[PDB]
Amino acid sequence: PDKTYEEMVKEVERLKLENKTLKQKVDSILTAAKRESIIVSSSRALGAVAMRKIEAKVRSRAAKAVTEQELTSLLQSLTLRVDVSMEELEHH
Amino acid sequence: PDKTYEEMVKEVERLKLENKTLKQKVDSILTAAKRESIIVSSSRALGAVAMRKIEAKVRSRAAKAVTEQELTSLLQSLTLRVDVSMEELEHH
Amino acid sequence: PDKTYEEMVKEVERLKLENKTLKQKVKSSGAVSSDDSILTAAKRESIIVSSSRALGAVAMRKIEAKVRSRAAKAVTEQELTSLLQSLTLRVDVSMEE
Amino acid sequence: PDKTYEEMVKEVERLKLENKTLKQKVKSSGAVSSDDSILTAAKRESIIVSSSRALGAVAMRKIEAKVRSRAAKAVTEQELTSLLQSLTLRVDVSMEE
Incomplete structure (x- = not known):
């Protein structure tokens, strides 16, 4: 409960x-x-949860790409639905 | 891509x-x-995602408890709906 | 230069x-x-x-079960991989279980 | 004693x-x-x-907007806290944005 926005906000909410x-x-x-x-x-904490979920998803979906033009195209064609909730903030 | 089940499984899936x-x-x-x-x-990796989501939720919901009997009761009354997906595995 | 973060550090102390x-x-x-x-x-x-670890173990039991069920349809590596990649499960858990 | 984990370590190398x-x-x-x-x-x-950071910034813009909208109904600390605690948002993002 001392470094990231997730941790700080979660502790403030608990207190x-x-x-x-x-x-x-x-x-x-x-x-x-x-x-x-x-x-x-609060938005920054949520934005942090979204950030890690987004990177995880992009990586999974980009997995099949082998070439640059291939990766580049796949990324630009992406649309991600991300769910974030305050109760998802990680304690540590 | 070298220590946890999330990391290992995500890398194996990418390869x-x-x-x-x-x-x-x-x-x-x-x-x-x-x-x-x-x-x-794969199940262990998913189970890892569930583990961190569950701890986060329990902590949030337990936040209002001040006494032992209070915390104990709140926990036993809990039912959590957890969503886990392979694309949510964290790379690092 | 995070003024917002500093305010929280103080707010946490105040609380x-x-x-x-x-x-x-x-x-x-x-x-x-x-x-x-x-x-x-x-x-x-x-x-x-x-308590969180206990609920985790329940979720873990249930998750494996659903993965087993889904993996039943695959017979090749490529099939199982494509199948797991888009996999999304929902799991309910209570200390009672 | 994780035989399953060892198999993956090898599998990753094979791959x-x-x-x-x-x-x-x-x-x-x-x-x-x-x-x-x-x-x-x-x-x-x-x-x-x-690319992930770019999508993150878009999600961040949208998230703040919805939090602002939800926080509009609260006028006390206790109200805003209870409101945010159960808050769940859904956000869509594309490199185009």
């Missing part, structure tokens, strides 16, 4: 959810700065 | 697909031993 | 501080059943990992 | 050997358009990574 639970045992309006901060960081 | 392409530029009946070998290794 | 303060009050106040206990980080990690 | 032999013949035979070329490993890796 926020644990905090909330701790509060019910004993909320605040969102600043625009904080909303922006959460949006950008 | 097999490249091999096939190389052959069309210039197939054999499956032995039962080889079918078993491919089945077990 | 830790407060969450440590809140556990303090939860304990001081008597809202922790004597029968129960507040999770230590190491304890939580031990339970979570152990 | 490399043969695939190196096959490229040899593909080159010797004239089936490589003078205009074209057989991919070197380092060259292939450079193109694949560069």
Whole structure:
């Protein structure tokens, strides 16, 4: 829970959810700065999951290519459907 | 392409697909031993993808738990839908 | 030059501080059943990992089964490879299993 | 004691050997358009990574957009957190974009 966006965001989300639970045992309006901060960081974490899924898929699909023109063509013809979810963020 | 099941299987699949392409530029009946070998290794690679997705999800869902009885209960109540695909194997 | 990342590093610390303060009050106040206990980080990690590994083993059992079923149709290396390459499985798992 | 893993280590080597032999013949035979070329490993890796990064950037643009749209409904920290926690997005990407 210390280096990548996935790790950092996942830990922040866990602490926020644990905090909330701790509060019910004993909320605040969102600043625009904080909303922006959460949006950008969360998006980056999701974007990280998408990045690794995309590279994995491209590699698999490009596997059959042997020549440059072959690889180049296959890539440009590609359209990938990628699913990313916050619960998929890796802890470490 | 040298340590985990994901990495090894992904590289074997790439070489097999490249091999096939190389052959069309210039197939054999499956032995039962080889079918078993491919089945077990492929399953292990997929199982590896499932493992990391499952841990990620459990952690996210368990986030709100603060006590032991709380965590224990939440876990036992869990049912996870996990999607794994061969093209998701990570190269490195 | 990641200002957004720095803000999170601080936010994580803020959350830790407060969450440590809140556990303090939860304990001081008597809202922790004597029968129960507040999770230590190491304890939580031990339970979570152990449970995740258990679910993994269930998923692993089920995955192999489906791969076996799909691999039944192939009789050549090329067939099995093409078949596995596009393979996508869905697996459900519960601690009960 | 992984007999299955050992078999793959050998299989990867076998495939490399043969695939190196096959490229040899593909080159010797004239089936490589003078205009074209057989991919070197380092060259292939450079193109694949560069292309993957390009698609990643497109996915990243789209993902942020959807997060922005979803985060529009939240006005408190607790709301946004609960909202993002269950968030699942689907994104399509093509080199064209």
